[PDB]
Assembly symmetry: C2
Protein backbone atom coordinates (compact mmCIF):
# COMPACT_ATOMS: atom_id res chain seq x y z
CA UNK A 1 0.00 0.00 0.00
CA UNK A 2 1.26 3.46 -0.97
CA UNK A 3 -2.01 5.20 -0.12
CA UNK A 4 -1.99 8.98 0.24
CA UNK A 5 1.89 13.24 2.93
CA UNK A 6 1.64 9.55 2.05
CA UNK A 7 1.93 6.35 4.09
CA UNK A 8 3.43 3.08 2.84
CA UNK A 9 2.39 0.11 5.00
CA UNK A 10 3.21 -3.32 3.61
CA UNK A 11 5.46 -6.37 3.72
CA UNK A 12 8.42 -6.83 1.38
CA UNK A 13 10.08 -10.08 0.36
CA UNK A 14 13.25 -11.29 -1.38
CA UNK A 15 14.70 -7.76 -1.19
CA UNK A 16 18.26 -8.31 -2.40
CA UNK A 17 20.99 -6.38 -0.63
CA UNK A 18 18.76 -5.32 2.26
CA UNK A 19 21.15 -6.60 4.94
CA UNK A 20 24.20 -4.49 4.12
CA UNK A 21 25.28 -2.19 6.98
CA UNK A 22 25.65 0.68 4.47
CA UNK A 23 22.12 0.32 3.05
CA UNK A 24 20.12 3.51 3.68
CA UNK A 25 17.95 4.37 0.67
CA UNK A 26 15.16 2.13 -0.62
CA UNK A 27 12.97 2.45 -3.72
CA UNK A 28 9.56 0.78 -3.55
CA UNK A 29 7.11 0.81 -6.48
CA UNK A 30 3.87 -0.25 -4.80
CA UNK A 31 0.16 0.46 -5.06
CA UNK A 32 -2.54 3.26 -12.61
CA UNK A 33 -1.35 2.41 -9.10
CA UNK A 34 2.33 2.46 -10.17
CA UNK A 35 3.83 5.17 -7.94
CA UNK A 36 7.45 4.65 -6.88
CA UNK A 37 8.51 6.61 -3.79
CA UNK A 38 11.85 6.65 -1.99
CA UNK A 39 11.72 5.43 1.61
CA UNK A 40 14.77 5.77 3.88
CA UNK A 41 15.33 2.64 5.94
CA UNK A 42 16.13 4.64 9.09
CA UNK A 43 12.54 5.93 9.16
CA UNK A 44 10.33 4.47 11.91
CA UNK A 45 8.37 1.36 11.01
CA UNK A 46 11.07 -0.29 8.87
CA UNK A 47 12.54 -3.44 10.40
CA UNK A 48 14.25 -6.43 8.80
CA UNK A 49 12.40 -9.65 9.58
CA UNK A 50 14.57 -12.65 8.72
CA UNK A 51 17.23 -13.70 6.19
CA UNK A 52 16.26 -15.80 3.19
CA UNK A 53 18.53 -18.67 2.16
CA UNK A 54 18.78 -20.03 -1.39
CA UNK A 55 20.09 -23.61 -1.52
CA UNK A 56 21.62 -23.06 1.91
CA UNK A 57 23.84 -20.13 0.89
CA UNK A 58 23.37 -16.91 2.85
CA UNK A 59 24.89 -14.92 -0.05
CA UNK A 60 27.09 -12.66 2.07
CA UNK A 61 28.15 -10.78 -1.07
CA UNK A 62 18.07 -11.57 0.94
CA UNK A 63 16.80 -10.39 4.32
CA UNK A 64 13.05 -9.80 4.42
CA UNK A 65 11.78 -6.25 4.96
CA UNK A 66 8.64 -5.10 6.78
CA UNK A 67 7.18 -1.60 6.46
CA UNK A 68 4.57 -0.93 9.16
CA UNK A 69 3.01 2.48 8.42
CA UNK A 70 6.14 4.48 7.66
CA UNK A 71 5.60 8.24 7.61
CA UNK A 72 7.48 9.95 4.77
CA UNK A 73 7.10 13.41 3.20
CA UNK A 74 5.79 14.00 -0.30
CA UNK A 75 9.30 15.05 -1.35
CA UNK A 76 10.49 11.44 -1.01
CA UNK A 77 8.01 10.43 -3.73
CA UNK A 78 13.97 1.58 -17.46
CA UNK A 79 14.55 -2.19 -17.45
CA UNK A 80 16.45 -2.39 -20.75
CA UNK A 81 19.98 -1.73 -19.50
CA UNK A 82 19.30 -3.85 -16.42
CA UNK A 83 18.28 -6.89 -18.45
CA UNK A 84 21.16 -6.38 -20.89
CA UNK A 85 23.80 -6.27 -18.14
CA UNK A 86 22.18 -9.13 -16.22
CA UNK A 87 22.43 -11.27 -19.35
CA UNK A 88 25.99 -10.20 -20.20
CA UNK A 89 27.27 -11.09 -16.72
CA UNK A 90 25.65 -14.52 -17.00
CA UNK A 91 27.29 -15.02 -20.41
CA UNK A 92 30.69 -14.21 -18.94
CA UNK A 93 30.05 -16.63 -16.09
CA UNK A 94 29.16 -19.37 -18.57
CA UNK A 95 32.33 -18.68 -20.55
CA UNK A 96 34.47 -19.06 -17.43
CA UNK A 97 32.60 -22.25 -16.51
CA UNK A 98 33.30 -23.69 -19.96
CA UNK A 99 36.99 -22.79 -19.66
CA UNK A 100 37.20 -24.55 -16.28
CA UNK A 101 35.39 -27.63 -17.58
CA UNK A 102 37.65 -27.87 -20.65
CA UNK A 103 40.77 -27.57 -18.50
CA UNK A 104 39.50 -30.28 -16.14
CA UNK A 105 38.56 -32.58 -19.03
CA UNK A 106 42.04 -32.22 -20.52
CA UNK A 107 43.82 -32.68 -17.17
CA UNK A 108 42.00 -35.91 -16.29
CA UNK A 109 35.74 -39.57 -24.33
CA UNK A 110 33.31 -38.58 -27.08
CA UNK A 111 30.46 -37.53 -24.77
CA UNK A 112 32.55 -34.88 -23.00
CA UNK A 113 33.61 -33.49 -26.38
CA UNK A 114 29.96 -33.33 -27.46
CA UNK A 115 29.11 -31.51 -24.22
CA UNK A 116 31.90 -28.98 -24.84
CA UNK A 117 30.74 -28.34 -28.40
CA UNK A 118 27.10 -27.86 -27.36
CA UNK A 119 28.14 -25.49 -24.57
CA UNK A 120 30.19 -23.39 -27.00
CA UNK A 121 27.29 -23.25 -29.47
CA UNK A 122 24.85 -22.10 -26.79
CA UNK A 123 27.27 -19.49 -25.44
CA UNK A 124 27.84 -18.00 -28.90
CA UNK A 125 24.12 -17.85 -29.66
CA UNK A 126 23.28 -16.19 -26.34
CA UNK A 127 26.07 -13.62 -26.71
CA UNK A 128 24.84 -12.75 -30.20
CA UNK A 129 21.27 -12.31 -28.95
CA UNK A 130 22.39 -10.07 -26.09
CA UNK A 131 24.50 -7.88 -28.36
CA UNK A 132 21.67 -7.58 -30.89
CA UNK A 133 19.25 -6.46 -28.17
CA UNK A 134 21.77 -3.94 -26.84
CA UNK A 135 22.39 -2.50 -30.31
CA UNK A 136 18.64 -2.28 -30.96
CA UNK A 137 18.25 -0.33 -27.71
CA UNK A 138 21.15 1.93 -28.71
CA UNK A 139 20.16 2.79 -32.27
CA UNK A 140 16.37 2.72 -32.73
CA UNK A 141 15.32 4.17 -29.39
CA UNK A 142 14.46 2.29 -26.22
CA UNK A 143 10.72 1.68 -26.79
CA UNK A 144 11.26 -0.60 -29.82
CA UNK A 145 13.32 -3.34 -28.14
CA UNK A 146 10.94 -5.03 -25.70
CA UNK A 147 10.75 -8.19 -27.82
CA UNK A 148 14.51 -8.75 -27.78
CA UNK A 149 14.65 -8.01 -24.05
CA UNK A 150 12.02 -10.66 -23.32
CA UNK A 151 13.84 -13.03 -25.67
CA UNK A 152 17.15 -12.69 -23.81
CA UNK A 153 15.27 -13.01 -20.52
CA UNK A 154 13.95 -16.37 -21.73
CA UNK A 155 16.91 -17.87 -23.56
CA UNK A 156 20.00 -17.39 -21.40
CA UNK A 157 19.20 -18.97 -17.99
CA UNK A 158 18.13 -22.36 -19.38
CA UNK A 159 21.26 -22.91 -21.47
CA UNK A 160 23.54 -21.54 -18.74
CA UNK A 161 21.98 -23.88 -16.17
CA UNK A 162 22.45 -26.79 -18.58
CA UNK A 163 26.11 -25.85 -19.02
CA UNK A 164 26.59 -25.65 -15.25
CA UNK A 165 24.98 -29.08 -14.82
CA UNK A 166 27.25 -30.58 -17.48
CA UNK A 167 30.30 -29.02 -15.83
CA UNK A 168 29.45 -30.32 -12.36
CA UNK A 169 28.75 -33.74 -13.91
CA UNK A 170 32.15 -33.79 -15.64
CA UNK A 171 33.81 -32.83 -12.35
CA UNK A 172 32.23 -35.94 -10.81
CA UNK A 173 36.59 -25.41 -6.54
CA UNK A 174 35.11 -22.11 -7.76
CA UNK A 175 32.51 -24.01 -9.81
CA UNK A 176 30.38 -24.32 -6.67
CA UNK A 177 29.94 -20.54 -6.48
CA UNK A 178 29.19 -20.36 -10.21
CA UNK A 179 26.51 -23.05 -9.92
CA UNK A 180 25.05 -21.29 -6.87
CA UNK A 181 24.80 -18.01 -8.79
CA UNK A 182 23.40 -19.67 -11.93
CA UNK A 183 20.75 -21.51 -9.91
CA UNK A 184 19.79 -18.42 -7.89
CA UNK A 185 19.43 -16.37 -11.08
CA UNK A 186 17.15 -19.06 -12.55
CA UNK A 187 7.21 -18.84 -17.88
CA UNK A 188 5.20 -15.66 -18.48
CA UNK A 189 7.79 -14.14 -20.80
CA UNK A 190 7.01 -16.83 -23.38
CA UNK A 191 3.36 -15.73 -23.36
CA UNK A 192 4.43 -12.10 -23.70
CA UNK A 193 6.70 -12.94 -26.65
CA UNK A 194 3.88 -14.90 -28.28
CA UNK A 195 1.53 -11.93 -27.89
CA UNK A 196 4.07 -9.55 -29.43
CA UNK A 197 4.78 -11.96 -32.29
CA UNK A 198 1.07 -12.35 -33.03
CA UNK A 199 0.65 -8.57 -33.03
CA UNK A 200 3.62 -8.19 -35.39
CA UNK A 201 2.24 -10.82 -37.77
CA UNK A 202 -1.17 -9.12 -37.72
CA UNK A 203 0.43 -5.74 -38.45
CA UNK A 204 2.57 -7.07 -41.32
CA UNK A 205 -0.46 -8.50 -43.15
CA UNK B 1 46.47 -50.56 -0.96
CA UNK B 2 45.49 -53.77 0.84
CA UNK B 3 48.90 -55.39 0.39
CA UNK B 4 49.74 -58.43 2.51
CA UNK B 5 48.91 -60.05 8.60
CA UNK B 6 47.97 -57.40 6.05
CA UNK B 7 48.36 -53.61 5.97
CA UNK B 8 45.88 -51.18 4.39
CA UNK B 9 47.44 -47.76 3.73
CA UNK B 10 45.40 -45.39 1.59
CA UNK B 11 43.14 -42.36 1.44
CA UNK B 12 39.35 -42.62 1.39
CA UNK B 13 36.87 -40.06 0.06
CA UNK B 14 33.12 -39.35 0.14
CA UNK B 15 32.68 -42.01 2.85
CA UNK B 16 29.04 -41.53 3.82
CA UNK B 17 28.19 -41.84 7.50
CA UNK B 18 31.82 -41.69 8.64
CA UNK B 19 31.22 -38.86 11.12
CA UNK B 20 28.67 -40.54 13.38
CA UNK B 21 29.84 -40.90 17.00
CA UNK B 22 28.59 -44.51 17.00
CA UNK B 23 30.55 -45.53 13.87
CA UNK B 24 33.06 -48.26 14.72
CA UNK B 25 33.22 -50.86 11.93
CA UNK B 26 34.34 -50.07 8.38
CA UNK B 27 34.36 -52.26 5.26
CA UNK B 28 36.91 -51.34 2.58
CA UNK B 29 37.20 -53.24 -0.71
CA UNK B 30 40.58 -52.06 -2.00
CA UNK B 31 43.52 -53.43 -3.94
CA UNK B 32 41.84 -60.02 -9.03
CA UNK B 33 42.75 -57.35 -6.48
CA UNK B 34 39.20 -57.29 -5.04
CA UNK B 35 39.74 -58.24 -1.38
CA UNK B 36 37.36 -56.64 1.12
CA UNK B 37 38.61 -56.61 4.72
CA UNK B 38 36.98 -55.17 7.83
CA UNK B 39 38.94 -52.38 9.50
CA UNK B 40 37.84 -51.01 12.90
CA UNK B 41 38.04 -47.23 13.02
CA UNK B 42 39.55 -47.24 16.52
CA UNK B 43 42.69 -48.92 15.15
CA UNK B 44 45.79 -46.69 14.96
CA UNK B 45 46.30 -44.83 11.70
CA UNK B 46 42.63 -44.02 11.03
CA UNK B 47 41.79 -40.33 11.32
CA UNK B 48 38.99 -38.28 9.77
CA UNK B 49 40.37 -35.47 7.62
CA UNK B 50 37.62 -32.96 6.82
CA UNK B 51 33.86 -32.87 6.18
CA UNK B 52 32.56 -32.73 2.61
CA UNK B 53 29.65 -30.41 1.82
CA UNK B 54 27.19 -30.97 -1.03
CA UNK B 55 25.44 -27.76 -2.13
CA UNK B 56 26.28 -26.27 1.25
CA UNK B 57 24.42 -28.88 3.32
CA UNK B 58 26.47 -30.73 5.92
CA UNK B 59 23.93 -33.61 5.88
CA UNK B 60 23.78 -34.10 9.65
CA UNK B 61 21.44 -37.07 9.13
CA UNK B 62 30.54 -37.14 4.28
CA UNK B 63 33.70 -36.69 6.34
CA UNK B 64 36.86 -37.79 4.55
CA UNK B 65 38.80 -40.76 5.94
CA UNK B 66 42.55 -41.37 5.90
CA UNK B 67 44.15 -44.77 6.58
CA UNK B 68 47.90 -44.44 7.18
CA UNK B 69 49.31 -47.98 7.48
CA UNK B 70 46.71 -49.52 9.78
CA UNK B 71 47.76 -52.85 11.30
CA UNK B 72 44.92 -55.38 11.37
CA UNK B 73 44.92 -59.18 11.84
CA UNK B 74 44.06 -61.63 9.09
CA UNK B 75 40.83 -62.45 10.95
CA UNK B 76 39.45 -59.01 10.06
CA UNK B 77 39.70 -59.91 6.36
CA UNK B 78 25.54 -58.16 -3.57
CA UNK B 79 24.43 -54.85 -5.10
CA UNK B 80 20.98 -55.98 -6.26
CA UNK B 81 18.99 -55.32 -3.10
CA UNK B 82 20.93 -52.11 -2.52
CA UNK B 83 20.06 -50.69 -5.94
CA UNK B 84 16.44 -51.84 -5.63
CA UNK B 85 15.93 -50.12 -2.27
CA UNK B 86 17.83 -47.01 -3.36
CA UNK B 87 15.47 -46.69 -6.32
CA UNK B 88 12.32 -47.42 -4.30
CA UNK B 89 13.13 -44.72 -1.73
CA UNK B 90 13.67 -42.21 -4.55
CA UNK B 91 10.33 -43.20 -6.08
CA UNK B 92 8.58 -42.57 -2.77
CA UNK B 93 10.31 -39.21 -2.47
CA UNK B 94 9.13 -38.26 -5.97
CA UNK B 95 5.57 -39.28 -5.10
CA UNK B 96 5.59 -37.05 -2.02
CA UNK B 97 7.06 -34.19 -4.07
CA UNK B 98 4.28 -34.56 -6.64
CA UNK B 99 1.65 -34.54 -3.89
CA UNK B 100 3.11 -31.34 -2.43
CA UNK B 101 3.29 -29.66 -5.84
CA UNK B 102 -0.31 -30.59 -6.67
CA UNK B 103 -1.54 -29.24 -3.32
CA UNK B 104 0.37 -25.99 -3.85
CA UNK B 105 -0.93 -25.62 -7.42
CA UNK B 106 -4.51 -26.07 -6.22
CA UNK B 107 -4.10 -23.72 -3.25
CA UNK B 108 -2.69 -20.83 -5.31
CA UNK B 109 -2.91 -22.78 -15.96
CA UNK B 110 -2.37 -25.41 -18.65
CA UNK B 111 1.42 -25.65 -18.26
CA UNK B 112 1.21 -26.66 -14.60
CA UNK B 113 -1.33 -29.34 -15.51
CA UNK B 114 1.00 -30.63 -18.22
CA UNK B 115 3.85 -30.73 -15.70
CA UNK B 116 1.70 -32.71 -13.25
CA UNK B 117 0.69 -35.22 -15.92
CA UNK B 118 4.28 -35.74 -17.09
CA UNK B 119 5.46 -36.20 -13.50
CA UNK B 120 2.79 -38.83 -12.87
CA UNK B 121 3.72 -40.68 -16.07
CA UNK B 122 7.41 -40.75 -15.16
CA UNK B 123 6.69 -41.88 -11.59
CA UNK B 124 4.50 -44.76 -12.78
CA UNK B 125 7.08 -45.91 -15.34
CA UNK B 126 9.94 -45.83 -12.83
CA UNK B 127 7.93 -47.72 -10.20
CA UNK B 128 7.07 -50.40 -12.75
CA UNK B 129 10.72 -50.77 -13.77
CA UNK B 130 11.85 -51.06 -10.15
CA UNK B 131 9.23 -53.69 -9.33
CA UNK B 132 10.10 -55.68 -12.46
CA UNK B 133 13.78 -55.71 -11.52
CA UNK B 134 12.97 -56.77 -7.95
CA UNK B 135 10.73 -59.60 -9.15
CA UNK B 136 13.40 -60.75 -11.61
CA UNK B 137 15.90 -60.88 -8.75
CA UNK B 138 13.40 -62.79 -6.62
CA UNK B 139 12.30 -65.46 -9.09
CA UNK B 140 15.06 -66.28 -11.59
CA UNK B 141 18.06 -66.04 -9.30
CA UNK B 142 20.25 -63.02 -8.65
CA UNK B 143 22.81 -63.42 -11.46
CA UNK B 144 20.25 -62.89 -14.26
CA UNK B 145 19.10 -59.37 -13.35
CA UNK B 146 22.12 -57.13 -13.96
CA UNK B 147 20.51 -55.52 -17.02
CA UNK B 148 17.41 -54.38 -15.12
CA UNK B 149 19.57 -53.14 -12.23
CA UNK B 150 21.64 -50.97 -14.57
CA UNK B 151 18.43 -49.81 -16.24
CA UNK B 152 16.90 -48.60 -12.96
CA UNK B 153 20.24 -47.03 -12.04
CA UNK B 154 20.03 -44.99 -15.25
CA UNK B 155 16.35 -44.11 -15.50
CA UNK B 156 15.19 -42.92 -12.07
CA UNK B 157 17.52 -40.02 -11.10
CA UNK B 158 16.99 -38.00 -14.29
CA UNK B 159 13.19 -38.03 -14.14
CA UNK B 160 13.17 -37.46 -10.38
CA UNK B 161 15.49 -34.46 -10.74
CA UNK B 162 13.23 -33.10 -13.49
CA UNK B 163 10.20 -33.49 -11.22
CA UNK B 164 12.02 -31.70 -8.38
CA UNK B 165 12.97 -28.86 -10.73
CA UNK B 166 9.36 -28.50 -11.90
CA UNK B 167 8.14 -28.49 -8.30
CA UNK B 168 10.58 -25.81 -7.17
CA UNK B 169 9.67 -23.78 -10.27
CA UNK B 170 5.94 -24.01 -9.48
CA UNK B 171 6.66 -22.92 -5.91
CA UNK B 172 8.28 -19.78 -7.35
CA UNK B 173 9.04 -25.88 3.15
CA UNK B 174 10.09 -29.54 3.15
CA UNK B 175 10.67 -29.39 -0.63
CA UNK B 176 14.13 -27.94 0.05
CA UNK B 177 15.24 -31.14 1.79
CA UNK B 178 13.73 -33.27 -0.98
CA UNK B 179 15.58 -31.29 -3.66
CA UNK B 180 18.80 -31.53 -1.64
CA UNK B 181 18.47 -35.32 -1.41
CA UNK B 182 17.51 -35.71 -5.08
CA UNK B 183 20.47 -33.60 -6.19
CA UNK B 184 22.92 -35.39 -3.89
CA UNK B 185 21.73 -38.78 -5.16
CA UNK B 186 22.26 -37.60 -8.76
CA UNK B 187 27.21 -42.13 -17.83
CA UNK B 188 29.02 -45.49 -17.80
CA UNK B 189 25.87 -47.48 -17.08
CA UNK B 190 24.56 -46.61 -20.54
CA UNK B 191 27.68 -48.16 -22.07
CA UNK B 192 27.25 -51.24 -19.88
CA UNK B 193 23.60 -51.59 -20.93
CA UNK B 194 24.60 -51.21 -24.58
CA UNK B 195 27.21 -53.96 -24.20
CA UNK B 196 24.70 -56.31 -22.56
CA UNK B 197 22.07 -55.55 -25.22
CA UNK B 198 24.56 -56.23 -28.02
CA UNK B 199 25.54 -59.52 -26.39
CA UNK B 200 21.88 -60.49 -26.04
CA UNK B 201 21.17 -59.67 -29.70
CA UNK B 202 24.22 -61.68 -30.77
CA UNK B 203 23.10 -64.65 -28.66
CA UNK B 204 19.52 -64.57 -29.96
CA UNK B 205 20.65 -64.78 -33.60
Amino acid sequence: TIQRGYIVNGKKWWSSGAGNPKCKIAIVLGRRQHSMILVPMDTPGVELIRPLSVFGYMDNMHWEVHFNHVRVPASNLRLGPGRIHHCMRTVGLAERILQIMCDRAVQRHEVVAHWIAKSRIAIEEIRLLTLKAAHSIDTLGSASARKEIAMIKVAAPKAVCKIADWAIQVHGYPLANMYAIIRTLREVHLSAIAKMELQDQARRL
